[PDB]
Amino acid sequence: DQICIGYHANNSTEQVDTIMEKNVTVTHAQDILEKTHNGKLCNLDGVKPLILRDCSVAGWLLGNPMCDEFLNVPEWSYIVEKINPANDLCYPGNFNDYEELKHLLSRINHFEKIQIIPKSSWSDHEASGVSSVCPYQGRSSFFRNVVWLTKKDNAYPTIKRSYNNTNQEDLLVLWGIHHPNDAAEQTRLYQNPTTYISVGTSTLNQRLVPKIATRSKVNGQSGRMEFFWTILKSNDAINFESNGNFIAPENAYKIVKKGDSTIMKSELEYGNCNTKCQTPIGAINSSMPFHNIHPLTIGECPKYVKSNRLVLATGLRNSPQ
Amino acid sequence: DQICIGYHANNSTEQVDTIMEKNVTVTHAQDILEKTHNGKLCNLDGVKPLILRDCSVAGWLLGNPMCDEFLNVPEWSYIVEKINPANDLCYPGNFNDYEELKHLLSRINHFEKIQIIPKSSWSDHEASGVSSVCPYQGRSSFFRNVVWLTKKDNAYPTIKRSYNNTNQEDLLVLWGIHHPNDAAEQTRLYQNPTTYISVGTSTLNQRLVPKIATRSKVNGQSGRMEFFWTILKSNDAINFESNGNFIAPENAYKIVKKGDSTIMKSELEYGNCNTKCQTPIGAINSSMPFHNIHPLTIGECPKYVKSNRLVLATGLRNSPQ
Amino acid sequence: DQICIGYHANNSTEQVDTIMEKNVTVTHAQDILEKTHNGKLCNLDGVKPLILRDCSVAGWLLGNPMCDEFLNVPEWSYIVEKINPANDLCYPGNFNDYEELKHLLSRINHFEKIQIIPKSSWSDHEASGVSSVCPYQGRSSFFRNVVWLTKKDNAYPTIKRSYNNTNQEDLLVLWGIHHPNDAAEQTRLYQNPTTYISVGTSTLNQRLVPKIATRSKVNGQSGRMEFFWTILKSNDAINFESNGNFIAPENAYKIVKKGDSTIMKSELEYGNCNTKCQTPIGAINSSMPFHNIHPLTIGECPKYVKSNRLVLATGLRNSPQ
Amino acid sequence: EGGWQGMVDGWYGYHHSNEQGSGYAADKESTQKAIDGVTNKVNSIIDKMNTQFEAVGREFNNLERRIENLNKKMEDGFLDVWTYNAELLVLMENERTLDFHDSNVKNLYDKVRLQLRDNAKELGNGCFEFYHRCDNECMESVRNGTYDYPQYSEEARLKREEISS
Amino acid sequence: EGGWQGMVDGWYGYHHSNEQGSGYAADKESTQKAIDGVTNKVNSIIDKMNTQFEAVGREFNNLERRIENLNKKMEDGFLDVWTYNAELLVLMENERTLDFHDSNVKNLYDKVRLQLRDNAKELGNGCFEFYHRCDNECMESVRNGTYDYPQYSEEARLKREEISS
Amino acid sequence: EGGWQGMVDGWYGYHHSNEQGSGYAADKESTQKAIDGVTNKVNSIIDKMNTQFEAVGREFNNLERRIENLNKKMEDGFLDVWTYNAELLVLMENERTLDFHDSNVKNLYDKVRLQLRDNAKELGNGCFEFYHRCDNECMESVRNGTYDYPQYSEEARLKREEISS
Ligand SMILES: *[C@@H]1O[C@H](CO)[C@@H](O[C@@H]2O[C@H](CO)[C@@H](O[C@H]3O[C@H](CO[C@H]4O[C@H](CO)[C@@H](O)[C@H](O)[C@@H]4O)[C@@H](O)[C@H](O[C@H]4O[C@H](CO)[C@@H](O)[C@H](O)[C@@H]4O)[C@@H]3O)[C@H](O)[C@H]2NC(C)=O)[C@H](O)[C@H]1NC(C)=O
Ligand SMILES: *[C@@H]1O[C@H](CO)[C@@H](O[C@@H]2O[C@H](CO)[C@@H](O[C@H]3O[C@H](CO[C@H]4O[C@H](CO)[C@@H](O)[C@H](O)[C@@H]4O)[C@@H](O)[C@H](O[C@H]4O[C@H](CO)[C@@H](O)[C@H](O)[C@@H]4O)[C@@H]3O)[C@H](O)[C@H]2NC(C)=O)[C@H](O)[C@H]1NC(C)=O
Ligand SMILES: *[C@@H]1O[C@H](CO)[C@@H](O[C@@H]2O[C@H](CO)[C@@H](O[C@H]3O[C@H](CO[C@H]4O[C@H](CO)[C@@H](O)[C@H](O)[C@@H]4O)[C@@H](O)[C@H](O[C@H]4O[C@H](CO)[C@@H](O)[C@H](O)[C@@H]4O)[C@@H]3O)[C@H](O)[C@H]2NC(C)=O)[C@H](O)[C@H]1NC(C)=O
Ligand SMILES: *[C@@H]1O[C@H](CO)[C@@H](O[C@@H]2O[C@H](CO)[C@@H](O)[C@H](O)[C@H]2NC(C)=O)[C@H](O)[C@H]1NC(C)=O
Ligand SMILES: *[C@@H]1O[C@H](CO)[C@@H](O[C@@H]2O[C@H](CO)[C@@H](O)[C@H](O)[C@H]2NC(C)=O)[C@H](O)[C@H]1NC(C)=O
Ligand SMILES: *[C@@H]1O[C@H](CO)[C@@H](O[C@@H]2O[C@H](CO)[C@@H](O)[C@H](O)[C@H]2NC(C)=O)[C@H](O)[C@H]1NC(C)=O
Ligand SMILES: *[C@H]1O[C@H](CO)[C@@H](O)[C@H](O)[C@H]1NC(C)=O
Ligand SMILES: *[C@H]1O[C@H](CO)[C@@H](O)[C@H](O)[C@H]1NC(C)=O
Ligand SMILES: *[C@H]1O[C@H](CO)[C@@H](O)[C@H](O)[C@H]1NC(C)=O
Hints:
The complex is a heterohexamer, with three copies of chain A and three copies of chain D. Chain A is mostly beta strands. Chain A is 7% helix and 37% strand. Chain A has three helices and 29 strands. In chain A, strands 9, 10, 13, 15, 18, 20 and 21 form a seven-stranded mixed beta sheet that branches. Chain A has a four-stranded antiparallel beta sheet with strand order 14-19-16-17, with no helix packed on it. In chain A, strands 5-26-28 form a three-stranded parallel beta sheet, with no helix packed on it. Chain D starts with 11 loop residues before the first strand and ends with a helix. The longest helix of chain D is centred in the middle third of the chain and has 52 residues, at 65-116. In chain D, strand 1 (12-18) and strand 2 (21-26) form a beta hairpin. Chain D is rod-shaped. A two-stranded antiparallel sheet of chain D has the order 1-2. A two-stranded antiparallel sheet of chain D has the order 4-5. The chains are: A mainly beta, D alpha+beta. Strand 1 of chain A pairs antiparallel with strand 1 of chain D. Bound molecules: a molecule of 5 linked components (NAG-NAG-MAN-MAN-MAN) (3 copies), a molecule of 2 linked components (NAG-NAG) (3 copies) and 2-acetamido-2-deoxy-beta-D-glucopyranose (NAG) (3 copies). Residues 164, 235-237 of chain B line the site of a molecule of 5 linked components (NAG-NAG-MAN-MAN-MAN). Chains A, B, C: Its main location: host cell. Chains A, B, C: This is Hemagglutinin. Chains A, B, C: One of its GO terms (cellular component) is host cell plasma membrane. Chains A, B, C: One of its GO terms (biological process) is clathrin-dependent endocytosis of virus by host cell.
């Protein structure tokens, strides 16, 4: 007669590693590494992303004629662009402190476009300014949130304009300057050969003089446009003075900003999903402490790790008799 | 007859956690987390902080009329401001590279105010310049380390001034420019309508032209002042040339800089204490390897941790018989 | 008769520490800390460093008359300068965005000097400009990659020059401006008292006006030179327009840039060695997971650690009988 | 020598073989304490991770490559810290868990060994060969700590005398 | 079954019960080695922390929020690394310490078990019930490893014969 | 009591002393498993380190000291994380390795203890003093698990009877 002492076995082929032993077959195990994603862009903690398909932030803000115009969400938790987007600046240029702008717009609690200076209020300047790299439906056109001012009759009187932010929300205001190719273009467009833009706030004290020089044609254009912005505080006023080259605000944006995220680059499509953690390759179900999906995550995420496998032995050695 | 083998017990209710078991009552234990602070701002490794009560670094450096003037310490290990300070720039403006200035002044081995250009040396310009946002005791006044120059008789001759740093210590020099609201103010104050400031060192090559524009009234003021600084090396000279809008140095600062700290924001008061680690909520006795007091620490600190409790079992299970 | 159970001993004096016990003598042990280096600067993953002996990156790029000229390597993995180098800017000045330039040049896949504007193509300006802080062999001389233009006869006609980058490689272009000491020097050198440099690319839109002011003599010089650069893309053109003070490109550099490293400061000499990890005190054989050589490492390095010793017990306690 | 397929109702236990037959019985006490110990281990490893909101993105331009590089050293820094610590943490806890089971088995063995004494012999395979006859009730009595050794002491002794002669 | 209030002079030890009375005696050797082992553990955990001067402050302006965010990822990064590693380090070392005590107790038990052999029986509670009479001197002799087993072997055998009949 | 110089051919083993002489014999089975276990430990500690290309350099100017300071907090941050974790990782694994050897020795001891039973007495020093005579073949038989206990049981009993009288 015999009585033996021993332990459980089963059909499990789950293997685990120890400090001292590799590939120990074990009865039960638990991977602590998250490896699966859902292949979709999702709301993040309940808030939809701002998805710009083939649009830059710059072209979206300026009201680019290509880009879709039902791209008005009251609020967003992160922004998604394509890896390489196609609708940036129709007229060659740049945006000043562009990266800080993108970062500030990456998460917005409230956003609302308002008209700040009607296009029709320019009585003694032409507002009809337009170019053949900014078509809208076939006619040479322009950005819709911003107006290219040019001389009327044969004159460009000094512009002196102010806007008092009466809203209790802070205002994102955009304007630019046009850098012509030569003095002939300068006076053709603005009459006055020598020209300035001055912009004033409780905080901002700006003076821009256009740079008139020979330049590389970019999309056939040798001129440049440079855009600028600020946040006009609740009861503050912005003051514009210019005698040429001024690309004026038409619309501005009420903005409430309580925190940040970033700009994601993803080819993916919006699913109708909710996640605590979004990746550019899909969303992730953020229960495990570690993941190996992608480093560029947004949300409350597990820690990114360079591993295939993190498997914790739970049951016993499976060496059956 | 019996002999038993066993272990010690006592009245201890100290609980510890293990990987496998929660809330094991134990005979003796040792918390490795520091959780207590002394509620005071202290010397840091023996050196007093520079405590600016309701003063900015900018207003303290410029010699702000509000701020206390016995705020002269030979040396300091960190700076403390209030969370929101009340005596910043009396006249609306800004300081150029302000954050780098604050950071550089955050820890100073030696600091000493010296007069570099007496107020009384301005023979053909008025030095008496003053404003009603910079009162001192009732009379409109100004910053004491810096002089507002204005026209005398009805003229502003070009200023051409140099200062050779004869000390063996490096010199922190401050100056500014005044951006008027319009050409009428410009010539009223300086006569010359068109105006520059030039500033030269072995390193610095600066040219400032004032920006004359319409602006938001801030404390009733539409003009702005902008301040600038450098470190004038031991045998180097600084050269000033201006025909208007120049806010001149009167006093500068001998500075010895051997390392950095930062600016702390704290409501607290100076105790008469010494610590290796200061927090904005109190000082900490830096023996344990981990703490949960506050993240913004200065000194040789334990590692900040998001925990209530880090308790190491030392004695035995306390399950009495 | 007896039979005993026991374990191996030997003459080993290797000591190890445990959590609970210090200085346990042990039969065999393995240090996991790398502590030795070879005292030489080495190729890094097979690619030689660019070793500038007593030359700055700036003076090397500008073609400094002191610096050696067989300092042409097709490719390099990191750059080494001395801790304090002696051949920087012969004429006092500075380089714009210098640190970004150094960083960009820290690792280059292909580099090749090409002549972009021959010295002999300046028909109506003098190219012979030279100074007594830039000797080469005894005659006052200058940088070889860059030309100091001055008036010819008694005139300085507007320069209008373009260069189309026909190569398929991107081009690093350098130019500068001369900031004279006064109007007399200005017209002596350039005739035209009032002067500009304009520089244009598909990306760059630059306007430089020289700053004419009184300044500290540095190496006997009160004037300054300021250098600038860009990367001219493959089929892009750069356009230069100036009526004075222009320090023109002669040679530029074809550049292929696939990744970064940094600038090492080392007194050491190049050995004929290959490493995966270089330190400024010598190269390291990167097998162990931890090292204590130096923090400023380049390559695939072990983790820097503040330790003398990381010794893993392998054998048994050595307490002989 | 190994594990047991047939012990389907617990982690640790007993196999008996007598004249009435043979089969497996689990010790549900030590099993359930193991199943709670290992569940705490996993839950501690998971629940001690503190995670907050982060947005990791590349938002530096081409004149900010030094800061982009700083951000890169940082990200790689954390990747390495996490990769190594998680990999080693798994390895270390696995050795601990597998030793924990071995410890539980050995304790169940000792409970039996002290009960039997010289009434059985140890085979060196985790089994005991009885000298006397151990019926189904006798086996149950060894499992639940109730084995009473005097009842078989006399019968068992003569049987080792029989072996020694 | 548990610990002992009455053993006030040491960590591990013995309780005896005979005709002359009962009481606790500590093993001061294994106790002091435990008290040094655990003091090294705590001291290692504390003293291996290298700390240098740092000034953590928020000194980026509102056109430097990308760098402020970099500094934030960093700070949170370190907070998480430290929080998790310190939490897990406590958990792991606690299991180790509590097992260390169990190991020390078990060793003290074995020293007795080899000494007594068949002169006593194991009760399965960490006690041994002697077959013979063990006076105060006999008890001391078991504690200090001096127990001499022949003196009681004959007396103890008849007494198991008495039990088996 | 300690280790053994004379056991030059293995890590764990046996020393025997009889009338024919004395000497050391290693258990090559448990030794080789130890020598593989400890080699895996070291290799895991080394091979789990993931290292990528980095260029750590100081490339911020004197109007970028806030960013230089950020880069400094970072570097010191990682230095501390690595220093503490590597120091503690060595300490923890060393205690584990030294306990692993103790565990292997104790198991080799138990294999002998179950074989001998009352035919030898435990001395409490890791040795067994036989009651009967154990020749060179008898010793080999104890090492390789072949010891047959009936052959000596009778001879050994009378010899404890001789001691008890
Ligand atoms: C955008 O428009 C806003 C108006 O819709 C501007 O804000 C207003 O500006 C006025 C004038 O600059 C300032 O207020 C005046 O009244 C205050 C009292 O304000 C307090 O009481 C108000 C009235 O009941 C409340 O509404 C306020 O919340 C607060 O409780 C007086 O103290 C001032 O007096 C001083 O200045 C005058 C003018 O010269 C002197 O003559 C006096 O002697 C005295 O010294 C102001 O007159 C205030 O800024 C604000 N008022 C309101 C109601 O909002 C805003 O400035 C504008 N932004 C810009 C940049 O222009
Ligand atoms: C702030 O003021 C300081 C003076 O108090 C200025 O420093 C002095 O400037 C002078 C003139 O620029 C320079 O020195 C001249 O003498 C040196 C020799 O210096 C060495 O010997 C000195 C004299 O004993 C010591 O004091 C020094 O430490 C050092 O050992 C000569 O070599 C120079 O000669 C050259 O230049 C002259 C002038 O044209 C030529 O004619 C000669 O042919 C020759 O080639 C200098 O004359 C030096 O800079 C310094 N001297 C002292 C004593 O400090 C400082 O420059 C000023 N700062 C600014 C920015 O203006
Ligand atoms: C540096 O020099 C380069 C030339 O060596 C410049 O690039 C060339 O510029 C020309 C003129 O600006 C542009 O190309 C013209 O031809 C394209 C077709 O290009 C496509 O076919 C080419 C010809 O076979 C291929 O070589 C190309 O790879 C590509 O496949 C036409 O579509 C354009 O037509 C439009 O513009 C003309 C001019 O006014 C209008 O009249 C027409 O009606 C039409 O709308 C161009 O004419 C092109 O940029 C490029 N060509 C080549 C061969 O490289 C480069 O621009 C220069 N850099 C700068 C900054 O100046
Ligand atoms: C057992 O150990 C081996 C080492 O020989 C591990 O080998 C790796 O296995 C992975 C997983 O599929 C392969 O992708 C790798 O190529 C292997 N590495 C090498 C160097 O060969 C193996 O993974 C271990 N197996 C398990 C299941 O844990
Ligand atoms: C024993 O475990 C429990 C889990 O049930 C721990 O619960 C936390 O206790 C803290 C400390 O006071 C409370 O603040 C938390 O609210 C509890 N968490 C939850 C989810 O209930 C408990 O702390 C443990 N006790 C000790 C003393 O270590
Ligand atoms: C044994 O422990 C002692 C502590 O008393 C360690 O002491 C250090 O030894 C180093 C190494 O040579 C010396 O540089 C230090 O000065 C010692 N520190 C102190 C505070 O005295 C000792 O290193 C340990 N020895 C070994 C070999 O591991
Ligand atoms: C064990 O695993 C296999 C594979 O899925 C499964 O089909 C089989 O039924 C399992 N056996 C038991 C007893 O659950
Ligand atoms: C145990 O703890 C209590 C609570 O403070 C204390 O008053 C009591 O005296 C302690 N007992 C002993 C024996 O120290
Ligand atoms: C042990 O170490 C010493 C010191 O080098 C060496 O000379 C000696 O020969 C070694 N002994 C053996 C047996 O290897």
